[PDB]
């Protein structure tokens, strides 16, 4: 069968199929809601726009990210984002597809636990696994040693690896990233 590789991070959901050369779907991980009242009846306005649709209606929505620094803070929003990724961007049924999720080193334990619980109860995937975002970088770089600096959008971290052995006591994590650079530029 085929496996799904969903890289959430925070600020860009990017998913696809295992064995491909690049992600198939790449879109912001935002969930917008209309903040005005709506006058035209018959428009049939929906109540929340997730993904790339929310970027076109920026003018009338209020955008929220459900992942602050690696950790997930709005579980309902994250559930909506996963539903959108599975059914509207990829158009696959998650009942017959193992899913590989990623997270950053040194996150709360309940984050990963509840991610698993959702992926099994709500979406009914047959299997799943959670990988560290730096080990995967080292895989894709064609190395087996090296220290990897994975500066995403919510979290930056170093993970030194040697011959395939990670040294956990030397892992650094810094909560300065692209979102803070955006706020500083603002």
């Amino acid at each position: 069968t085929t496996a799904l590789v969903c890289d959430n991070g925070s600020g860009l959901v990017k998913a696809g199929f295992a064995g491909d050369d690049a992600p198939r779907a790449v879109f912001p991980s935002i969930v917008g809601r209309p903040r005005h009242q709506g006058v035209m009846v018959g428009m049939g306005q929906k109540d929340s726009y997730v993904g790339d649709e929310a970027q076109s209606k920026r003018g009338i929505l209020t955008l929220k990210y459900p992942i602050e620094h690696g950790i997930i803070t709005n579980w309902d929003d994250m559930e909506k984002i996963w539903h959108h990724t599975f059914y509207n961007e990829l158009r696959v049924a998650p009942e017959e597809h193992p899913t590989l999720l990623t997270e950053a080193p040194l996150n709360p334990k309940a984050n990963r636990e509840k991610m698993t619980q959702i992926m099994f109860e709500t979406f009914n995937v047959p299997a799943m696994y959670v990988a560290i975002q730096a080990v995967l970088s080292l895989y894709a770089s064609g190395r087996t040693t090296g220290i990897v600096l994975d500066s995403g959008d919510g979290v930056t971290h170093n993970v030194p690896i040697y011959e395939g052995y990670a040294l956990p006591h030397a892992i650094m994590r810094l909560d300065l990233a692209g979102r803070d650079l955006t706020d500083y530029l603002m």
Binding site: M40, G42, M43, G44, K46
Partner: protein, 742 residues
């Protein structure tokens, strides 16, 4: 049995041969009906019921296993070949299929099925249509005589004469499966019991102007033909009337990927009349004309040139002149010229203006209007605001929708007026009393790319099937009030009306579609979203689509009586709009042709005047269906079901999938299912005794003693005063105990 002339065998086999065929072994336990792969259900035997494992030994030598949850008994031999399917001891789906299968192999065409009359067409001549059986039936009853349409014809006649009311014959089948000739023999029988030549003579006109190639048929009828056969006070032939209903207009503009427009455009495109082409500026190339080229250009349907000639002959022998045929042909050519018009937006505005003017000039020169004037009437309509006129603005989409609606309107207008001319030719001055109408309508068509038109067709057939179902309900209440046994006072119509309420009712599919083509920036995805938001789950029959075997596409699925149908949304908004242009209609009223008669006049204190823009094909269709129901619901109806045995012209051999398709889409299965809730096996006491007295050999006391000594439960049988009512299980158990008694 000699009263049936030479047709006696085909009409009904002798009692002697019946009994000689009765002697045949049949195991009631291990020869039950079994699901199949190549077909649905095949004749086979089971070796044993090994848990969840059985083995069906069919005739083909196969030994497949089927699950214990999909097996059901086969009809007993003592009740095979039954004339009335309703009297079958076990009412299953493939049961009736094999019944009619053996009946057509044994070459018995007609078969009673309760309130229906089913007729599989024989492909070779039979003596059953000789006038001897026609004349000799006079004096025999429906309940006893074997099935045939002459029976129901006479029953309708005598019903008319006793109740002083109209009757209705509803012949139901596919064009090219024998409907024409079935109605022909009907009208022959009616003339016999006392103008058919005129009917058949004017028929090619309707065949031209109301038939088009679909996928299932190359001569499919689109309009609802319906011939009213009036009579006098003395029940003698007086005159005949005809009306057209539900003629689909969308065909004149949009055609599917696999189908053509109406036949007439192609028949004119046959160069065998070069005078028509050089007088209408019609180039030979059919790809040239956009209204038509989107459909199937040409197919091996018929000899279209010869059909053009046959229609011209029928025209010249009909009451109307040669100039009138000339105007008809030129008007159709003008409709054809409408499609190639070209419009562009203006310089720095949102107004439509024509760039190409040549087809405009030629279409005006044909229609009898001015070209500049017609272009002005299309680009700048004028509307009435109180006591003044102000000019309305249009863009390209709006002017194109207006052009399409104008073409559909003029075509349908010419069609209705042609039917009026036909009826005027037919008209005889004899006084016309109560009539008996015969109705020809489209079928419950299913495909893999159902669309708006198929939804309209299925909605019509839903109204018809619900009508018949309520009719049969009142008929069963009549049987019960006669028998003095009255129970189960629920009607049989609402269970189907619940599906109608999902099309016509406000917030139903048609209302949502109308609202969506009224809204400013509506799209197909928004239409789908509104359908789902307003029906999904909150309804009972509306539900998700299904993707099977890689079908093309489906956006939602309804369930009907004839099964689950998946419909496609794409194009509905664009194809439902019918904005008629009032200024151009006035131009037509001021023409220099016959056109001014067709468009004679068409568009405070309480006015239901819907605007010109608030017009939808679905709404006009709902209105027409309403008035057709109002015309039918005043007459006592009768129903005729026509089935093709096989797609090949070779008789004898059939196609079980095609038989099942016809049964489902026709509603014979729905009739037997309405029966299956009461007591369908209904037999008197005398023959009951003569057949089951040896079980307890010795009228209510002895029957009751036998029943109590046969271990029959109370709710399983209903005790009547002339007939005692039993179900399938009761018949099976009584059969088994007789068999062990012997």
């Amino acid at each position: 049995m000699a009263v049936f002339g030479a047709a006696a065998p085909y009409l009904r086999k002798s009692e002697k041969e019946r009994l000689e065929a009765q002697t045949r072994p049949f195991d009631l336990k291990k020869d039950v009906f079994v699901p199949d792969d190549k077909q649905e259900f095949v004749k086979a035997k089971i070796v044993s019921r090994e848990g969840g494992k059985v083995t069906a030994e069919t005739e083909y030598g196969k030994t497949v296993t089927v699950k214990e949850d999909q097996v059901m008994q086969q009809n007993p031999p003592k009740f095979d070949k039954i004339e009335d399917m309703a009297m079958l001891t076990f009412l299953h789906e493939p049961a009736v299929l094999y019944n009619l299968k053996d009946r057509y192999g044994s070459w018995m065409i007609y078969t009673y099925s309760g309130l229906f009359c089913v007729t599989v067409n024989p492909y070779k001549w039979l003596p059953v249509y000789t006038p001897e059986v026609v004349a000799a039936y006079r004096g025999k009853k429906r309940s006893e005589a074997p099935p045939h349409i002459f029976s129901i014809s006479d029953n309708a006649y005598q019903y008319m004469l006793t109740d002083r009311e109209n009757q209705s014959i509803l012949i139901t089948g596919e064009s090219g499966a024998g409907k024409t000739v079935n109605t022909k023999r009907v009208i022959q029988y009616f003339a016999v019991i006392a103008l058919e030549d005129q009917i058949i003579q004017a028929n090619p006109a309707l065949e031209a102007f109301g038939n088009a190639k679909t996928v299932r048929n190359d001569n499919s009828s689109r309009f609802g033909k319906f011939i009213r056969i009036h009579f006098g006070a003395t029940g003698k032939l007086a005159s005949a009337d005809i009306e057209t209903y539900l003629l689909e207009k969308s065909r004149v503009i949009f055609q599917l990927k696999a189908e053509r427009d109406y036949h007439i455009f192609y028949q004119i495109l046959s160069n065998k009349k070069p005078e028509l082409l050089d007088m209408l500026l019609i180039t030979n190339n059919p790809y040239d004309y956009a209204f038509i080229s989107q459909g199937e250009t040409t197919v091996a349907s018929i000899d279209d040139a010869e059909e053009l000639m046959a229609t011209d002959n029928a025209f010249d022998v009909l009451g109307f002149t040669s100039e009138e045929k000339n105007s008809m042909y030129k008007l159709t050519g003008a409709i054809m010229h409408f499609g190639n018009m070209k419009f562009k937006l203006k310089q720095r505005e949102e107004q439509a203006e024509p760039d190409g003017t040549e087809e405009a000039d030629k279409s005006a020169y044909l229609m009898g209007l001015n070209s500049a004037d017609l272009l002005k009437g299309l680009c700048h309509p004028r509307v009435k605001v109180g006591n003044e006129y102000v000019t309305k603005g249009q863009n390209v989409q709006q002017v194109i929708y207006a052009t399409g609606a104008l073409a559909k309107a003029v075509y349908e207008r010419m069609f209705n007026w042609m039917v009026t001319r036909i009826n005027a030719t037919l008209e005889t001055k004899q006084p016309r009393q109560y009539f008996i109408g015969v109705l020809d309508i489209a079928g419950f068509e299913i495909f893999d790319f159902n669309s708006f038109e198929q939804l309209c067709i299925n909605f019509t057939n839903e109204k018809l099937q619900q009508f018949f179902n309520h009719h049969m309900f009142v008929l069963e209440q009549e049987e019960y009030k006669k028998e003095g046994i009255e129970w189960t006072f629920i009607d049989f119509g609402m269970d189907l009306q619940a599906c109608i309420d999902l099309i016509e009712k406000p917030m139903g599919i048609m209302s949502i579609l109308e609202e969506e083509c009224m809204f400013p920036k509506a799209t197909d995805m928004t239409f789908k979203a509104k359908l789902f938001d307003n029906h999904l789950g909150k309804s009972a029959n509306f539900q998700k689509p299904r993707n099977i075997k890689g079908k093309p596409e489906a956006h939602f699925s309804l369930i009907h009586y004839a099964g689950i149908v998946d419909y496609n949304i794409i194009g509905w908004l664009q194809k439902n709009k019918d904005p008629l242009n009032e200024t151009v209609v006035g131009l037509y009223q001021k023409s220099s042709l016959k056109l001014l008669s067709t468009l004679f006049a068409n568009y405070g204190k309480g006015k239901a005047k819907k605007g010109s823009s608030f017009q939808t094909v679905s709404a006009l269709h709902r209105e027409n269906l309403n008035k057709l129901m109002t015309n039918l619901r005043s007459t006592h109806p009768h129903f005729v079901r026509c089935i093709i045995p096989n797609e090949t012209k070779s008789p004898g051999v059939m196609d079980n999938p095609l038989v099942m398709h016809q049964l489902r889409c026709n509603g014979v299965l729905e009739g037997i299912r309405i029966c299956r809730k009461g007591f369908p096996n209904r037999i008197l006491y005398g023959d009951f005794r003569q057949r089951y007295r040896i079980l307890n050999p010795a009228s209510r006391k002895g029957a009751e003693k036998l029943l109590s000594s046969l271990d029959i439960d109370h709710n399983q049988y209903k005790f009547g005063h002339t007939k005692v009512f039993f179900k399938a299980g009761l018949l099976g158990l009584l059969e088994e105990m007789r068999d062990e008694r012997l």
